[PDB]
């Protein structure tokens, strides 16, 4: 029986990376089912999930061992559309970094299609399955809602200087600090919501620095986590050697 170790390193950043990868994330706030559906913007809150094809139980499936041995998710079974949740995360110590959101999704959720980019990270999945993953990302420490933002388009901000109130720039102003709490009053493609969503009080810069999976020279320097630099060196060496001759 193999116990996964996930990631090297012995700093707070490496420890936080293992927390994200293993899905051991502290719940910090609550979002209702309807508010989650509202911010995602794929259907009216509380409405039935639209479908892209009939339920598996209705149309039937080919009989092969994989379909028999691999259980379809509730979203696949229902024939849901594949929809998404996408985040931008500030490089100024947002808890999340793009690759580690994707690892979080790949390791802890079934039937997911994560994508990593510098300014955006996305999980595509059958809509109801996606909402399960979305809820954890919205509620737990993997997201600070000042330093991050749910953005399905026009994502610019991850590398831009922070606003003086500690909130990451949004071209389309979907969420901001109001009375010491983060309010989101548009969905992730910036269509105004009927009801604004309280995404809770932001982390202090101090707490963000402790919870972040990003290295920075003025918090926890990458150079100082020798194990992770060595890991890179070992992967590099081995890839180079085995490309010449796999021995």
């Amino acid at each position: 029986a193999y116990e996964r170790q996930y990631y090297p390193g012995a700093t707070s950043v490496a420890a936080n990376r293992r927390k994200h990868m293993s899905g051991k994330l502290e719940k910090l706030r609550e979002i209702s089912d309807e508010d989650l559906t509202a911010v995602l913007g794929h259907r009216a809150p509380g409405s039935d999930y639209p479908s892209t094809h009939p339920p598996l139980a209705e149309m039937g499936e080919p009989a092969c061992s994989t379909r028999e041995n691999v259980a379809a998710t509730p979203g696949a079974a229902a024939g849901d559309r594949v929809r998404y949740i996408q985040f931008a995360d500030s490089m100024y110590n947002a808890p999340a970094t793009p690759y580690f959101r994707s690892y979080f999704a790949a390791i802890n959720f079934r039937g997911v299609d994560p994508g990593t980019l510098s300014g955006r990270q996305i999980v595509e999945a059958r809509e109801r399955d996606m909402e399960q993953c979305a809820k954890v990302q919205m509620e737990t420490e993997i997201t600070d809602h000042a330093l991050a933002g749910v953005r399905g388009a026009t994502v610019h901000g991850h590398s831009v200087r922070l606003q003086e109130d500690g909130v990451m720039f949004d071209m389309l102003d979907r969420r901001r600090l109001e009375n010491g709490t983060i309010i989101m009053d548009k969905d992730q493609v910036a269509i105004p919501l009927d009801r604004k969503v309280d995404l809770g009080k932001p982390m202090s810069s101090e707490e963000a620095a402790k919870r972040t999976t990003i290295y920075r020279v003025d918090n926890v320097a990458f150079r100082d986590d020798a194990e992770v630099v060595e890991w890179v060196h070992r992967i590099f060496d081995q890839r180079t050697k085995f490309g010449f001759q796999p021995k």
Binding site: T97, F100, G115, S159, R161, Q163, E164, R216, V217, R223
Partner: protein, 568 residues
């Protein structure tokens, strides 16, 4: 190095801490992590205002919708500050839009000057005249041939009666010069036709070129830009061959169309032709002399900085700039896609002295740790190894990352992860090439940078940025058929490289760096190095980055315009 670091900081001050147009960025500390975003929209930028006005008027005039910033989702461009770019190594401050290739005649002309150029040997042609016709080829007959050729090449007649011809005013950029590794012949060539290798290159570099090509003679042909623009790259070698054939017929009193002429044709079109680049496979089908066929070594040799500078980093950096512009803005950003395209994917590597800062830091690090290995020399280089690559590339990348982190202005500047990846990896790769004299050690450094970058920030580039970078380290020293290749011979059609921005210009700089560190005359082809050692070409290939700046400020005069035949 200190001077470049000061230049980088000045760039950040100009870009972020003093107003550009009406963006109201009237002050600030370039190390500050925070900023105020004014939500001014596109009107903060005078070029954008000009574009909006033109878009409105043209839409009204032509009767169908056109440029309109309000069609942008959510809000128009410029909700944060629209800020300028300074061309690296210069004080030329540019409107961002003026660096889009469509808006920049210098950028378009650099490509036209490459596209409309090929090199054709003379020796085979002369052997043909000697063997088949019994003709005696002398300096006199060659000089007469060259004057006939420089009449014929732009599109003028030498044999038939009742010919129409191209208007000289439309094709004034078309000409043919010659060069030769035979010093005795070079002394006899009418100087108006000669690219003098002994004059244009240092004694060491001239020796390398002449030893490489031997006592052989070559034509540097540049066909009309207006023709290149009407047609394509594959036009070039055909155009050159037609008028070479006509000029041999006329100058040597051959039958105007005999069997021996066909040998001159095959010599000019195939046997003694050197193209800028070769054809591309079906999915990206293109004939010769298109950007995808242009090997990284060939671009390094078209760029003339190696001839006029003794600074190996400067030489590499000019090639990076030229390559990022051509390969990303015109090739990948237009030929292979289009639209708004990839201006700033490229500008990150030739503006605001950020790449230069990382690179010159590396040079000092290498010189300090490796007994001046980054200074010009062939016998002061470090043996390429995994150890040396890991040392230099890791140090390079850590410094570059720390600079982005200590200067939030630099991070906002290169806002895309791909831009930062290109800069960090280019510096690391160029550094490894400089220290080792091994271009593929440079490639290894490039890929190691990407790997360190990814783990440092938990992000790298865009969705498909590191297809080649994850295939990268393992394919550097592979000798498998479609994997192995020296970087000098690699290019945009090397399978891993065939798609994605942010790389090809860097690889060209890495190829160049391996040879500039050695003081080599060329990176892979002396024929191209000499061909473009010529100030008559409209684009100054010795200063490609600065040329882009001259284009931005509308002081670059291109060839190929049609105002002569256009109404008032």
């Amino acid at each position: 190095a200190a001077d470049i670091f000061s230049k980088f900081k000045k760039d950040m001050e100009v870009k972020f801490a003093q107003e550009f147009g009406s963006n109201k960025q009237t002050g600030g500390d370039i190390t500050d992590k925070t900023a105020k975003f004014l939500r001014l929209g596109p009107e903060q930028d005078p070029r954008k205002v000009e574009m909006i006005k033109a878009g409105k008027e043209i839409a009204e005039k032509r009767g169908i919708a056109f440029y309109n910033p309000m069609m942008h989702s959510g809000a128009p461009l410029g909700q944060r500050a629209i800020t300028p770019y300074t061309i690296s190594g210069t004080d030329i401050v540019c409107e961002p839009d003026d660096l889009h290739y469509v808006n920049n005649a210098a950028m378009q002309q650099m490509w036209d000057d490459i596209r409309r150029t090929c090199i054709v040997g003379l020796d085979m042609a002369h052997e043909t005249l000697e063997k088949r016709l019994g003709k005696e080829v002398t300096p006199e007959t060659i000089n007469h041939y060259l004057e006939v050729l420089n009449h014929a090449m732009p599109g003028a007649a030498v044999v038939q009666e009742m010919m129409v011809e191209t208007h000289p005013a439309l094709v004034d950029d078309c000409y043919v010069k010659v060069f030769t590794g035979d010093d005795a012949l070079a002394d006899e060539i009418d100087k108006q036709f000669l690219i003098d290798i002994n004059k244009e290159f240092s004694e060491e570099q001239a020796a390398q070129i002449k030893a490489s090509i031997g006592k052989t003679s070559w034509q540097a042909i540049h066909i009309p830009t207006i023709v290149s623009r009407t047609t394509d790259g594959a036009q070039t070698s055909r155009w050159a061959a037609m008028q070479i054939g006509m000029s041999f017929i006329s100058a040597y009193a051959m039958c105007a169309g005999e069997a021996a002429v066909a040998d001159l044709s095959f010599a000019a079109k195939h046997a003694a032709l050197v193209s800028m680049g070769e054809m591309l496979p079906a999915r990206r089908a293109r004939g010769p002399n298109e950007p995808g066929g242009l090997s990284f070594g060939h671009l390094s040799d078209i760029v003339q900085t190696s001839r006029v500078s003794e600074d190996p980093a400067k030489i590499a950096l000019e090639v990076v700039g030229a390559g990022c512009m051509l390969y990303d803005q015109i090739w990948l950003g237009s030929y292979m896609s289009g639209g708004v395209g990839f201006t700033q994917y490229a500008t990150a590597a030739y503006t605001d002295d950020i790449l230069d800062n990382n690179t010159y830091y590396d040079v000092d690090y290498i010189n300090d740790k490796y007994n001046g290995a980054a200074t010009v020399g062939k016998d002061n280089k470090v043996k390429a190894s995994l150890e040396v690559v890991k040392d230099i590339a890791t140090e390079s990348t850590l410094y570059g990352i720390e600079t982005y982190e200590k200067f939030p202005t630099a991070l906002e500047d290169h806002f895309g992860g791909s831009q930062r990846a290109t800069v960090l990896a280019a510096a690391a790769g160029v550094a490894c090439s400089l220290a080792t004299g091994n271009a593929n050690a440079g490639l290894s450094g490039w890929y190691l940078s990407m790997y360190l970058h990814k783990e440092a920030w938990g992000r790298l580039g865009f969705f498909g940025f590191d297809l080649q970078d994850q295939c990268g380290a393992t394919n550097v020293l592979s000798y498998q058929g479609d994997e192995g290749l020296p970087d000098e011979l690699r290019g945009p059609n090397y399978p891993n490289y065939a798609m994605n921005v942010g790389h090809q210009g860097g690889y060209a700089g890495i190829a160049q760096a391996a040879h500039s560190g050695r003081g080599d005359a060329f990176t892979v082809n002396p024929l191209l190095k000499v061909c473009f050692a010529d100030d008559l070409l409209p684009f100054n290939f010795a200063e490609p980055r600065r040329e882009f700046g001259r284009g931005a400020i509308r002081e670059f005069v291109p060839a190929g315009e049609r105002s002569l035949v256009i109404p008032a």
